[PDB]
Ligand binder design. Structure first.
Ligand SMILES: [Mg+2]
Ligand SMILES: [Mg+2]
Ligand SMILES: [Mg+2]
Ligand SMILES: [Mg+2]
Ligand SMILES: [Mg+2]
Ligand SMILES: [Mg+2]
Ligand SMILES: [Mg+2]
Ligand SMILES: [Mg+2]
Ligand SMILES: [Mg+2]
Ligand SMILES: [Zn+2]
Lengths: 135, 134, 136, 94, 176, 38
RNA sequence: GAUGUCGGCUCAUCACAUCCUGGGGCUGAAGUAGGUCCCAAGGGUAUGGCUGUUCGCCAUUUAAAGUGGUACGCGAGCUGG
RNA sequence: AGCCAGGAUGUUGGCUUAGAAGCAGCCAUCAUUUAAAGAAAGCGUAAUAGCUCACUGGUCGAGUCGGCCUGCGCGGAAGAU
């Protein structure tokens, strides 16, 4: 059972990692084994990405403090967040390969620049290379 | 699909691997020599775990895993058999340098992110077998 | 089985069992089993209950027995007419008035004491209630 | 801060006290100091829920007797022989 | 109560006739009629049916819940329709339909001929399968129970007439 | 069927029901748990 | 100022805490056969050896050989061990 | 409350045993990835598998849970004309 103190703690932690990160990915993860998840948690920590499953009511609270305040309409159904704190991109590509290889889920919506990205136009943050590519 | 633990340079006897994997539909002479040809680099006297993946055409493909946590703690402390009553009877001792040696080997199978995370996972296997951290 | 080691006299007048109990508080342990009824507890019932509650707590904690079967009970055998003297003592009873704390316990969590007392209560001829220690 | 509402007793004795308890109320006394003791009546449900809190027996309580406020401390309690009820409370002027 | 307060949506092509407590619900699959308990007040209005208690009746909300539930499966009945599927397990157990009669071979001396009631129809896609179809949920439910009754699933081999959605737990015979 | 004065739930799948003024224990998991008060 | 006692014979009548037959739940119920419980009182429910015996033991039956109440049913009905 | 989804890793924990891999027993009962998942509440296997729970994310959308003081009822409740 989650108390209010606990919920206020979870909103704080996901509000702190909201500001800091550059690209955030919101996706469905229903009907996928923990074996495949711990495998996306290894490939996430490696790419400098913060992975979490947060209550959609609790997300609409952490995201209200700007700039993801357009990811609201993506807080319907099971939600998993991929907050990239080290180098923009990483996740938006890590998820696309995980989605096609496992066939389950669809990937909800992506966020960057404080702007909404639809489920069809996620090719924008999927073709972006390194930082570290301009040289 | 079955999970087993066979020796580094030994795979053929009837009581441990014989009718255990042979009952499903796996070739007893094909796997026994293909396993020992790849585990030749693995040191003598160390049980190595192997997982079998079988299809409808009796064919097989195996992926070799790192030695178990309750296995490596026996050779590091200098014991053949563990304690019958753990944390009630002490059978050996292992240093902080020995804990990081088992963890660096187990890194390919461990779920942990950092060195400290994998080390604490081996600390738990030692306490539940009677071995004390010294 | 409880019983006085010696007594001034062997046999006692039937008497009556009116009034409310003395010793209505948990005075030694944390939990108690209080009598809500009126009646006689026999030395065997006292033992039956003590045994049931002890098994229940797996011989952990501490148990007190606040009652003592000091009343001798006589009985005339079969095929014996009335008179020709008072019968022979057969067993010992403790007179119980509503309010008596019968057994006390501590050193065990409430949930377990409650279960242990549920098991002991089933061996007794009188209705009982679970009681906890109070600040005055 | 525990606040108890009380009425002064218009009657005393066995008869009158038993009538109170039958009416979901209970007698109590306030004594101590230069002042005369004050025989009062309390709502059973209200004081019964209060006395469940450990603090009731340690803290200084306020008894509201017809406007006036009396600072007291729980001196003694007479509990029912087997029911979770209260028969009488001795309040000492604090 | 939570059931009674939930309105039943009467679709397009479904006729609702209310004469006091008597309700006739006509559709593409049939026509069903029910008499509601006196404690139920049924209101029509719009494309819905709403149920509620009647003043002076003690069990009004319990009654309105049942009334609701019944009228919902009546609506589903005269539209979509109901399907019960049974399956025969065991050597020699066979079934066939000849109009409105289910001939059953179930290990008895005489074959069992089960006459179907008005509104229930049956067809055998296999020699070991029975598919019932009707509008009345209670009647399809009754008929499927009666067919099962001839040979209820035994607990030692699962033999007998079972429901398709049935979990038949089997056990080992006494040891020695 | 077990007929006794004291009828109780014996497992999580046991359910207490009152059918025609008679307390009963109907159970989905174990038939041995089926009880009638009497 | 008398209410004849045990057992048998003859004749019964009720109860159900059911022996058989009927229905049914659980079973450590594969079947056959059992165990246990619920419903049920419609009918049915041995002959002999020994003993005054009731009982009981024994022999051989039977679907079964029920348990009790009726002044331990029944002597102005019989017997008299 | 129902329904959708997950219920993982070290690891088959150690000892024992022909085998004990959460699930004969005995002892310990931590640690990791975590939304959460007991070194496992029950059924199943020769041992594995397989099925489900504790726990958690989604859906739904307003109430829900069970102790106390009390009134009146229910079962417990079988007998002989
Ligand atoms: Mg008087
Ligand atoms: Mg009935
Ligand atoms: Mg005369
Ligand atoms: Mg009967
Ligand atoms: Mg019995
Ligand atoms: Mg008869
Ligand atoms: Mg016989
Ligand atoms: Mg006579
Ligand atoms: Mg004569
Ligand atoms: Zn049950």
């Amino acid at each position: 059972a989650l108390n209010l103190q606990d919920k206020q703690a979870i909103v704080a932690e996901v509000s702190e990692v909201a500001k800091g990160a550059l690209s955030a990915v919101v996706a469905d993860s229903r009907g996928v084994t923990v074996d495949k998840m711990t495998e996306l948690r290894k490939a996430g920590r490696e790419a400098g990405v913060y992975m979490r499953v947060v209550r959609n009511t609790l997300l609409r609270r952490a995201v209200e403090g700007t700039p993801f305040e357009c990811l609201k309409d993506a807080f319907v159904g099971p939600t998993l967040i991929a907050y990239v704190t080290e180098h923009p991109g990483a996740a938006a590509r890590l998820f696309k390969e995980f989605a096609k290889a496992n066939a389950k889920f669809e990937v909800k919506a992506a966020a960057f620049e404080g702007e909404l990205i639809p489920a069809s136009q996620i090719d924008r943050l999927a073709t972006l290379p390194t930082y570290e590519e301009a040289i | 699909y079955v999970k087993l633990q066979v020796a580094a340079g030994m795979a053929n006897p009837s009581p441990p691997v014989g009718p255990a994997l042979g009952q499903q539909g796996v070739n007893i002479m094909e796997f026994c020599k293909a396993f020992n040809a790849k585990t030749d680099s693995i040191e003598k006297g160390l049980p190595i775990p192997v997982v079998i993946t079988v299809y409808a055409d009796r064919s097989f493909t195996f992926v070799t895993k790192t030695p178990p946590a309750a296995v490596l703690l026996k050779k590091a402390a200098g014991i053949k058999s563990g304690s019958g009553k753990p944390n009630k009877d002490k059978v050996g001792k292992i240093s902080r340098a020995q804990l990081q040696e088992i963890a660096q080997t187990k890194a390919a199978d461990m779920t942990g992110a950092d060195i400290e995370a994998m080390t604490r996972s081996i600390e738990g296997t030692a306490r539940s077998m009677g071995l004390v951290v010294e | 089985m409880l019983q006085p080691k010696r007594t001034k006299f062997r046999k006692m007048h039937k008497g009556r069992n009116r009034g409310l109990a003395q010793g209505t508080d948990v005075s030694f342990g944390s939990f108690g089993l209080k009598a809500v009824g009126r009646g006689r507890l026999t030395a065997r019932q006292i033992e039956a209950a003590r045994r049931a509650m002890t098994r229940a707590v797996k011989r952990q904690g501490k148990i007190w027995i606040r009652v003592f079967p000091d009343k001798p009970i006589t009985e005339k055998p079969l095929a014996v007419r009335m008179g020709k003297g008072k019968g022979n003592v057969e067993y010992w009873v403790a007179l119980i008035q509503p309010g008596k704390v019968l057994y006390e316990m501590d050193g065990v969590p409430e949930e377990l004491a409650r279960e242990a007392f549920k098991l002991a209560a089933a061996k007794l001829p009188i209705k009982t209630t679970f009681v906890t220690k109070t600040v005055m | 801060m525990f606040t108890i509402n009380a009425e002064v007793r218009k009657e005393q004795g066995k008869g009158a006290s038993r009538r109170l308890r039958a009416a979901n109320k209970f007698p109590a006394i306030i004594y101590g100091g230069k002042e005369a003791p004050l025989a009062i009546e309390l709502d059973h449900d209200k004081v019964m829920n209060m006395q469940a809190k450990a603090e009731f027996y340690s803290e200084v309580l306020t008894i509201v007797v017809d406007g006036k406020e009396i600072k007291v401390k729980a001196q003694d309690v007479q509990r029912h022989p087997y029911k979770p009820k209260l028969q009488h409370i001795d309040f000492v002027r604090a | 109560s939570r059931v009674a307060k939930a309105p039943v949506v009467v679709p397009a092509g479904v006729d609702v006739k209310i004469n006091g407590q008597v309700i006739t619900i006509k559709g593409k699959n049939g026509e069903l009629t029910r008499t509601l308990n006196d404690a139920v007040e049924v209101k029509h209005a719009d494309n819905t049916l709403t149920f509620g208690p009647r003043d002076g009746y003690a069990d009004g909300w319990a009654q309105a819940g049942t009334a609701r539930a019944l009228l919902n499966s009546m609506v589903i009945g005269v539209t979509e329709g109901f399907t019960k599927k049974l399956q025969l397990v065991g050597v020699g157990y066979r079934a066939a339909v000849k109009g409105n009669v289910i001939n059953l071979s179930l290990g008895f001396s005489h074959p069992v001929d089960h006459q179907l009631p008005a509104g229930i129809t049956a067809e055998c896609p296999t020699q070991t399968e029975i598919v019932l179809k009707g509008a009345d949920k209670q009647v399809i439910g009754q008929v499927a129970a009666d067919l099962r009754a001839y040979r209820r699933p035994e607990p030692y081999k699962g033999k007998g007439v079972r429901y398709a959605d049935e979990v038949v737990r089997t056990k080992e015979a006494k040891k020695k | 069927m077990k007929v006794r004065a004291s009828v109780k739930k014996l497992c999580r799948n046991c359910k207490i029901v009152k059918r025609d003024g008679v307390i009963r224990v109907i159970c989905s998991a174990e038939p041995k748990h089926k009880q009638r008060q009497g």
